Amino acid sequence: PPAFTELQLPRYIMAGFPVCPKLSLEFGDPASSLFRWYKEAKPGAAEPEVGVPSSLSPSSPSSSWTETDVEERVYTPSNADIGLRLKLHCTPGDGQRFGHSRELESVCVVEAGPGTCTFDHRHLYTKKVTEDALIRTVSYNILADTYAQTEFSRTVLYPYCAPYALELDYRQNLIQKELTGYNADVICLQEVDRAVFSDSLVPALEAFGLEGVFRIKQHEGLATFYRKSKFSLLSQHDISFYEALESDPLHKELLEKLVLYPSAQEKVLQRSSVLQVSVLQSTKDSSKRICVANTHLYWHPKGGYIRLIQMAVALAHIRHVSCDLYPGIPVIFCGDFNSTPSTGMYHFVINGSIPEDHEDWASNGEEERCNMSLTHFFKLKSACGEPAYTNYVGGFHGCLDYIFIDLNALEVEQVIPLPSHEEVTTHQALPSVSHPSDHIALVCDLKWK
């Protein structure tokens, strides 16, 4: 019979933010599920019930719960719901019949939420899922809780941020609203904690028709979500840069240059950055396949040469996947590259070459110097161009994030505008009560050329 193996409500609920249940189904179809939301009739009206003998069971359903008109999986509370607990009544189905109906109450009440978030204005451009000819693509470093909880992040990096707004539950509510509100097709995320993927992103995004894949780095990792109605996952080709550089003959030539600089070599091989690669097939035209890559490069401000080497590994691996394993399919390469447009790594991506005398070959000092020349054959451009910044914190700001696209195979139809400098600095810098990351999500609508 159709039955829920998992059924969970969020730990924290805010007015104007979606309540996304976590559910797992056995012997049933997800499109057959029935939902009905209830809210307390008054703040504190519903007292949790103890078990009573069946002969003294209630003669009528409790007057402490009010039936809402919401029959959707996701419920967004209004400000009129502040102080109420919620209750979801749901039934699993297989298309022919229904399993036993289930009920679940929230532990928390609906809290007041921020009156405005930076993505509200941006959401005015993404009210609908794009037409079959487009690919709405997102790239976003969502700031891992493993880092945000440290004393260094709380008191050194983000001391201006309201401490409650840096907490996982608050930021996950904002991130869930932000991402679902973009109505996107391809979502590439960085700094995804394992529990954030399983308990926050998967429940929210699967309710809006997206499926995700996760790749760990060390303490957090990368996620790629894709809209099931527009794409199917064909194959995965994830790598760790240090493993691929040392073991794979694809990077043979690069390693020959690097071994001439033992100090620079050791530094690169001790980095744990990974590359997530997913080959997707269009559900509308099976002849249209896309290679979606996602990364998070070395963070250090003076790590220029390391990012150059990691990018050189990434592009050689992407070449192999998109041009050897597949017959020259278009590339979408998202990430937090930790590289501004005036750097060597960015010059290398856009120009297809970098000379050996670039200042970035000595970015971390003389001991770790590794002058070399590099080339790649891809014709790539930044889909959202070069914003003034994509990362804005008290101590630094810069354009670090990109959606790189094969400029011969894809073109940009729309760039969802980033918040203004005034809006970004409302609470001095990021994150804030109104913005759930130190980075700003890149969103664009792409089309096949």
Ligand SMILES: Cn1c(-c2c[nH]c3cc(C#N)ccc23)nc2ccc(C(=O)N3CCO[C@@H](c4ccccc4)[C@@H]3CO)cc21
């Ligand atoms: C991008 N960036 C620069 C920076 C400043 N100027 C730049 C210019 C370029 C360029 N081009 C690249 C980077 C920077 N300085 C930074 C300092 C900190 C972090 C940070 O928040 N993290 C890195 C260390 O690991 C994590 C962490 C661990 C423990 C505690 C807190 C965080 C976290 C992951 O993203 C990022 C910075």
Ligand SMILES: [Mg+2]
């Ligand atoms: Mg960070």
